[PDB]
Design a protein around this ligand. Structure first.
Ligand code: GTP
Ligand code: MG
Ligand code: MG
Lengths: 65, 285, 125, 125, 51
RNA sequence: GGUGUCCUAAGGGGGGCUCAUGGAGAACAGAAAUCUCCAGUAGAACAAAAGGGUAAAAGUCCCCUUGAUUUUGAUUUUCAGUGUGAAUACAAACCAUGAAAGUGUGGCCUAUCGAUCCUUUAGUCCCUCGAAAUUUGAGGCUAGAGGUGCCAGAAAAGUUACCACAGGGAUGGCUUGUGGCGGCCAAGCGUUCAUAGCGACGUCGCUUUGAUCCUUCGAUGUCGGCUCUUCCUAUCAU
RNA sequence: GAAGACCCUGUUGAGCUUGACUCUAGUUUGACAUUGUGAAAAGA
RNA sequence: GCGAUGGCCAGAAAGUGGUGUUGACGCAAUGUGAUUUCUGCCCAGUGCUCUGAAUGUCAAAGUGAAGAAAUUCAACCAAGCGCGGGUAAACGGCGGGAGUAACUAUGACUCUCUGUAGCCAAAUGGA
RNA sequence: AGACUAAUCGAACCAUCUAGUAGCUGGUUACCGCCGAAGUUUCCCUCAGGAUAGCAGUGUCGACCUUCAGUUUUAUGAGGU
């Protein structure tokens, strides 16, 4: 689920930051945490808002938020 | 409270932010006249839904000891009592008792005039439905005293008696009965309690013409002995609680008509008079 | 005075005796601040003498969980409902809304905007 | 400060500065801070990466490199007069002098360079 | 404030969420959902097993 | 309180019925088994601690739910370096039941650690204090009592990019050109005491009248250039 | 001078910091002695 | 910060040494770092310093009582701490402006806030 | 500048305590003969964990006495499939 994001200028790096490697949903009114306190990184290119949802009874697929 | 029903009873009896409608206990002493019993019956008829009734004789004198009243209120969860008695000195007495936290908040004696008392059955009219709240009118100069007195306390107790269940809405067909209490300042003044039914007639305008017809009972009282509250107990009883549905107002924070939370910012006046511009070489003569 | 030791400091501040403490607590550091500053130091696994990981790093556990969804009646109900009166009031508010530069939006209301905003124009449709 | 009090639920607020190259973003951060905490140069593109500066306990300032949103109606002359490019790295610089002479009043140029009597930009130069 | 509530307030112990504190757990070996306590709870596991 | 057993849990709603006991009767049955009638204000049961709890019930049996702690909230209180907020209060919706009026639920709690431990009591006719005796005191040994409110206690941190030492190390006959999910059709495979199950080819749903140009969405993973030779073909040119 | 540099391990060594632990130089406070001879009071 | 029976140091100590052949236009320790520019606004939480009232914590020495004594119990109890005041207001916090019923800290409860090269300053308006 | 203090400096050089300690690294010297192995068995807070069962070799001693047996058959279980 998480990969290690390495920080620092030395050869030995700090390894506390974790990047989420799967698609996520961040919700409305989302502002990212500052970098000094952002342990979990949910990248913008992996954030989703909509989904193709099928109604099993009506047999209709609609793109829903 | 191991049993769930007893747990429910305890949760009903627990203190709440929005309190339940008050319950009135109707009871009588060892000696009580038939007129006093009739008056208690008429008051119970006006307040059937939120009243309980005792049927025995109680050797209790309220202005000497009220431990038995405190015990009865604690056992019955009744925060009001109407207590009937009779003496040679006081032939027909209705003692209104209001309590706070199963201790006596205040008490007031009413002396009933026996020659002018008419019951509800003595008027051949259509009566009030069970559980329906009447509107209230308090008339006369006895209730606007700057100092709290017996008439102010009587008005407060009668409002607390006839208030019924509070509601944010009312049907226009539930405006058919009115209770009118009249009393003037001054040898002893008389507090008159009357109940009327209301009919409406055309007047050529939007508003109807109101005409009244007597419903009963017809009571005349003289205010008697009085037990005032302890000031600290009264302050505790007259504290008002804020419901969760009453939002505590924040500075510069509001909710608009679409439900969004909105913040207000304040720029202030733009005063560029104290700004010196750059004295460029091209702007010099 | 009383003393600069940790016993003296806790007795001076009136803490409860016998309470557990986080390693590294002092006058300048509370437990929350120590957790905050230990986050920056986390990320290194525990290894044996041959370099094999015996305890994984934080959020690197490698243990595969049981990904199971229980049966529940709540999965088959409506989470959000709205009435026609509420929708009509929101539509009137949508028509009445104006723009003020000196007000800012702090928290949007989760609303079914497709049923509240006006439709596209005639020529566009 | 007003914005911080409005967002008092968070630990802090972040204020990011955007705009064209050389409009004064790093200078604004230094002016607010009271100290030269960001690099300032008259050349465009002095700031290349984002920088956090802690203004107060609950306010952060984020410096950003300058941006030019691409427009099909903007010309290289317009960009050069807005200050996007370094003029040492352009070819044929005197072709932009007529735009400068149109933009600046004539008597302002005359008092700036103590020079008068030219009929075109080549003779002026 | 009780002793637990005072201790949790001092130690920064946050209350468990309602999803976290459910009387439900998934038994892997039997592949079923079971209660942690109560009637037929997992705290009384094996009291009705044959061997 | 200690053991050994049993239960589609408690709860909620609705409906029907009336209890303890006494009298008179009924093979065994006789003070005491079951059945029948009459009388029985509850003298039974269940909750609490009435000085007026409950009788076509709040008791007891049937029917239905048992879904073991629902959803939403710009609101209340507390908290949140993991701020789609959490917990909590209130409200609304839902849900169960009933013909209905209605009724009712959507938990109760709690720091932890020792018991081979801690605190404390008695021994008069127990032993010893080593030169002897008495009185205090102390130790030993034995027998008791209580259980973290009154049973004591439970606070030995970091950094080194100035550094050092002893050691150990530095997926693969993979890949390539044609999306996923959901439905339908379907030659065939199966099945023909069950007519279910697999299923290529396809197909159908989601993912601007040649426009707009006022929406560029995150370095943990590192590439190069020079010189020079050869091979592959998955061919740009001839 | 690659037995380098880097990573990993230590009953690791050493330098450095701080309400980490135990001490301590210095400093501050009190008491005793060095410290004697007369008064005037207040208490025994 | 220091006016000499002193400050800053050094020494194991000393009838010990240095500053000192010294005396605030001096000596010692800090931070900043020519000139020019330059002091967002307001406090009072941490801290700085006040012999201002207390014994609230309160060692040793000393005092009294009980006991046959070991011993035990009582008051008394300095500085520092605590309490209560002013600040280098340094750190720090700090959206303003009005009112009031509170009446002093903390209030609290309402209201509402968005010149194509000038003027003013002792030539200049600057980094 | 942790710079310099005799090519020696985040603590000079010389001798001694001192053959300091290492669980880590390296090494550890003729031949033939007879036997000859082992990896959660059970308990304990774990890794920077322990014991312990089991498996072996030399001696003996006891009547080296009783016989036993990773096997089949018989009866009866499980598997009625
Ligand atoms: N006259 C004047 N010059 C200013 C002002 N503010 C900034 N400048 C100058 O403008 C130039 C640009 O300043 P920057 O702070 O580097 O602006 P920028 O947009 O961040 O430039 P980038 O680093 O490229 O992004 C500097 O040389 C400043 O001296 C101002 O208020 N007045
Ligand atoms: Mg620039
Ligand atoms: Mg810049």
């Amino acid at each position: 689920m998480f990969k290690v994001v390495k920080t620092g200028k030395k050869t030995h790096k700090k390894g506390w930051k974790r990047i989420v490697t799967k698609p996520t949903f961040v919700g409305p009114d989302f502002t990212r945490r500052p970098v000094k306190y952002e342990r979990f990184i949910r990248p913008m290119g992996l954030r989703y808002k909509k989904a193709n949802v099928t109604h099993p009874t009506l047999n209709v697929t609609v793109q829903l938020p | 409270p191991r049993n769930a029903r007893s747990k429910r009873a305890l949760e009903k009896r627990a203190p709440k932010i929005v309190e339940n409608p008050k319950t009135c206990l109707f009871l009588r002493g060892t000696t009580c006249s038939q007129i006093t019993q009739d008056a208690m019956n008429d008051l119970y008829a006006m307040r059937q839904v939120h009243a309980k009734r005792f049927h025995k004789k109680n050797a209790i004198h309220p202005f000497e000891d009220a431990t038995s009243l405190c015990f009865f209120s604690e056992k019955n969860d009744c925060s009001l009592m109407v207590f009937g008695s009779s003496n040679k000195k006081r032939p027909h007495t209705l003692t209104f008792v209001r309590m706070f936290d199963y201790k006596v908040l205040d008490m007031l004696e009413f002396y009933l005039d026996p020659d002018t008392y008419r019951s509800i059955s003595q008027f051949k009219t259509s009566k009030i439905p069970i559980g329906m709240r009447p509107m209230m009118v308090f008339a006369g100069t006895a209730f606007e005293s700057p100092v709290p007195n017996a008439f102010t306390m009587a008005k407060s107790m009668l409002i607390d008696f006839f208030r019924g269940e509070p509601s944010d809405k009312i049907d226009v067909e539930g405006l058919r009965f009115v209770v009118v209490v009249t009393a003037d300042e001054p040898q002893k003044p008389i507090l008159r309690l009357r109940v009327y039914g209301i009919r409406t007639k055309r007047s050529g305008t939007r508003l109807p013409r109101v005409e009244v017809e007597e419903h009963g009972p017809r009571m005349d009282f003289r205010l008697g002995r009085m037990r005032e509250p302890d000031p600290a107990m009264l302050k505790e009883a007259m504290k008002k609680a804020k419901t969760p549905q009453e939002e505590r107002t924040k500075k510069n924070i509001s909710m608009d008509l679409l439900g969004d939370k909105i913040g207000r910012i304040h720029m202030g006046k733009t005063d560029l008079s104290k700004l010196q511009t750059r004295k460029m070489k091209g702007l010099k003569r | 005075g009383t003393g600069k030791k940790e016993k003296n400091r806790l007795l001076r501040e009136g803490r409860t005796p016998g309470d557990p403490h986080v390693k590294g607590e002092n006058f300048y550091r509370s437990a929350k601040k120590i957790k905050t500053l230990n986050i920056l130091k986390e990320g290194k696994p525990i290894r044996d003498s041959k370099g094999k990981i015996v305890k994984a790093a934080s959020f690197q556990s490698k243990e595969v969980p049981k990904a199971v969804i229980e049966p529940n009646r709540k999965w088959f109900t409506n989470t959000r409902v709205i009435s026609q009166d509420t929708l009509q009031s929101f539509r009137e508010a949508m028509a009445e809304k104006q723009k003020d530069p000196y007000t800012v939006l702090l928290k949007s209301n989760k609303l079914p905007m497709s049923l509240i905003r006006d439709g596209p124009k005639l020529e566009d449709g | 400060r007003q914005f911080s009090v409005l967002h008092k639920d968070r630990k802090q607020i972040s204020v990011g500065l955007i705009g064209y190259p050389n409009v004064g973003k790093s200078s604004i951060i230094n002016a607010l801070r009271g100290k030269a905490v960001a690099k300032v140069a008259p050349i465009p593109g002095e700031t290349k990466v984002w920088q956090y500066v802690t203004l107060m306990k609950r306010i952060y300032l984020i410096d950003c490199p300058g941006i030019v949103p691409p427009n099909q109606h903007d010309t290289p002359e317009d960009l050069l007069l807005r200050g996007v490019v370094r003029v040492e790295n352009v070819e044929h610089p005197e072709q932009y002098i007529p735009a400068v002479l149109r933009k600046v009043k004539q008597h302002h140029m005359e008092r700036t360079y103590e020079l008068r009597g030219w009929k075109d930009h080549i003779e002026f130069l | 404030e009780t002793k637990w509530q005072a201790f949790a307030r001092r130690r920064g112990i946050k209350p468990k969420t309602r999803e976290q504190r459910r009387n439900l757990q998934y038994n892997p070996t039997t592949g079923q959902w079971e209660r942690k306590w109560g009637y037929k709870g997992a705290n009384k596991r094996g009291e009705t097993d044959p061997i």
